[PDB]
């Protein structure tokens, strides 16, 4: 299958209470594998998945250097954004950066990403061709013109199609035993009377990886969205995910309803009915 690597970095200014906090986390697919937190004790990039631990001391030295330098750069970008938006030194602001790359089953480059958001809104993003920028407002167009003049897109493309995919391919190899897995959902259905006239059927999906999944209710084989509830997919805390979907049905009509489960770990989609 295809795979993704992403780093998610957050800078939060806090006037009066020190320099901005900077935290960065790295993921392959839905599995976190590194972190750096400027407020934590170690001041190093730290492992958060077993398969990254076999990286040598030079890895941790170089990754720490990059993420510490980037924290300083985004401290400066927080100051620049204040100037561009005519904001005071009093308030707290957020600067988020995401970047990474996708590879196919043969390990070849598919896509790259590099984008920034300021106070929760898009600021600037590298477009899909890795050759031009989307600027979200007039302030970001200053940055876009600057980055065009300095050919930053070409620098980004060199990383995203090179060292980015080199890393993703390496991590997939070192983390072979766990990152290639598809844990299918373990499914079951519960039944709860809620009145003399209605009952809730709840269809559970537990223990699955990756997180992508679909749960849908049908009645008499037709899609049913009214009188349903569906929670957002949530981490179990052990590297797998959970979801459920519920429907409120007339008492005695339970057998008209089916829950449909699609997940890559499943040989075929499931059609589940209340048992009894």
């Amino acid at each position: 299958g295809s795979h993704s690597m992403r780093y998610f970095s957050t800078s939060v200014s806090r006037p009066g209470r020190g320099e901005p906090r900077f935290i960065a986390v790295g993921y392959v697919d839905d599995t976190q594998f590194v972190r750096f937190d400027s407020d934590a004790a170690s001041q190093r990039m730290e492992p958060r998945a077993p398969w990254i631990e076999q990286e040598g001391p030079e890895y941790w030295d170089e990754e720490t250097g990059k993420v510490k330098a980037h924290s300083q750069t985004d401290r400066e970008n927080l100051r620049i954004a204040l100037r561009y938006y005519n904001q005071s030194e009093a308030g707290s602001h957020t600067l988020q950066m995401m970047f990474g790359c996708d590879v196919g089953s043969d390990g070849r480059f598919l896509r790259g990403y590099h984008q920034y958001a300021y106070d929760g809104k898009d600021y600037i993003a590298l477009k899909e061709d890795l050759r031009s920028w989307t600027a979200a407002d007039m302030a970001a167009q200053i940055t876009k013109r600057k980055w065009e003049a300095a050919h930053v897109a070409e620098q980004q493309r060199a990383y995203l199609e090179g060292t980015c995919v080199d890393g993703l391919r390496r991590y997939l190899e070192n983390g072979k035993e766990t990152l290639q897995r598809t844990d299918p959902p373990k499914t079951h259905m519960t039944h709860h009377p809620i009145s003399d006239h209605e009952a809730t059927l709840r269809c559970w999906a537990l223990g699955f990886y990756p997180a992508e999944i679909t749960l849908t209710w049908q009645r008499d084989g037709e899609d049913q969205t009214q009188d349903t509830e569906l929670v957002e997919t949530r981490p179990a805390g052990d590297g797998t995910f959970q979801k459920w979907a519920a429907v409120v049905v007339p008492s005695g009509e339970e057998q008209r309803y089916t829950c449909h489960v699609q997940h890559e770990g499943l040989p075929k989609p499931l059609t589940l009915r209340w048992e009894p």
Binding site: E63, N77, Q156
Partner: peptide, 9 residues
Amino acid sequence: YFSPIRVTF
């Protein structure tokens, strides 16, 4: 591998 690119706004 973290990005090596550090540029200002």
